[PDB]
Amino acid sequence: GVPTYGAIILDETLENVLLVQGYLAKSGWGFPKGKVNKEEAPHDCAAREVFEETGFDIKDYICKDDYIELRINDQLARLYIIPGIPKDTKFNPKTRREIRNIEWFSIEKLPCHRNDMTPKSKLGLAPNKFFMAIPFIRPLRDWLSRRFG
Ligand SMILES: CC(C)n1ccc(C(=O)NCc2ccc(F)cc2)n1
Q1: Does domain 1-149 have CATH number 3.90.79.10?
Q2: Which residue's CA is the nearest one to ligand 1's atom 18?
């Protein structure tokens, strides 16, 4: 699969993260990210996808070594960590045909796993609108503890 790049943007307090909500298959909440183009450097793809989805340019803030990367079903997703962005920043996507809404979420309230259905003796996981963000939440909380305390 083609690698994806984007950002985990936090506010000044470090307790909120910015998620975006797409449509249809991308109908839940997730970190802003997208597929890398031919010859495009990972930091440039992250800034482009982030600016396409939020209107906010992270180029002057990206730190090369500060990211979380996960391999999910043989697709690599790397989100550069971008703290300290004021909560009153005006985010607007470029294409409202792709992004429904953009919101800050409390990190501590976000789930870091989906729930089973052991109540119902049924296998699998219950739907959760934060499905795409979930895999990054525990690695983020651990990264913030290490790098900030
Ligand atoms: C399996 C399905 C649920 N899926 C695939 C990708 C996403 C996702 O990333 N959702 C949030 C999102 C990010 C970028 C964007 F441009 C629009 C929406 N969700």
Answers
A1: yes
A2: 22
Q: Which amino acid is at 89?
A: T
Between the alpha carbon of residue 52 and those of residues 58, 89, 92, 145, the distances in Å are 11, 16, 9, 30
Using what technique was this structure determined?
X-ray
The answer to whether the CB of 98 is under 6 A from ligand 1 is yes
- In units of Å, what resolution does this entry have? 1.8
**Is the CB of 129 inside a 6 Å radius of any atom of ligand 1?**
no
Residue whose C-alpha is closest to residue 53's, from 24, 18, 81 = 18
Kindly report the CA angle at 103 between 28 and 127, in degrees rounded to 5? Answer: 25
> Rounded to whole angstroms, how far apart are CA atoms 38 and 137?
29
Separation of 132 CA from ligand 1 center, angstroms?
A: 7
What DSSP state is assigned to residue 71?
A: E
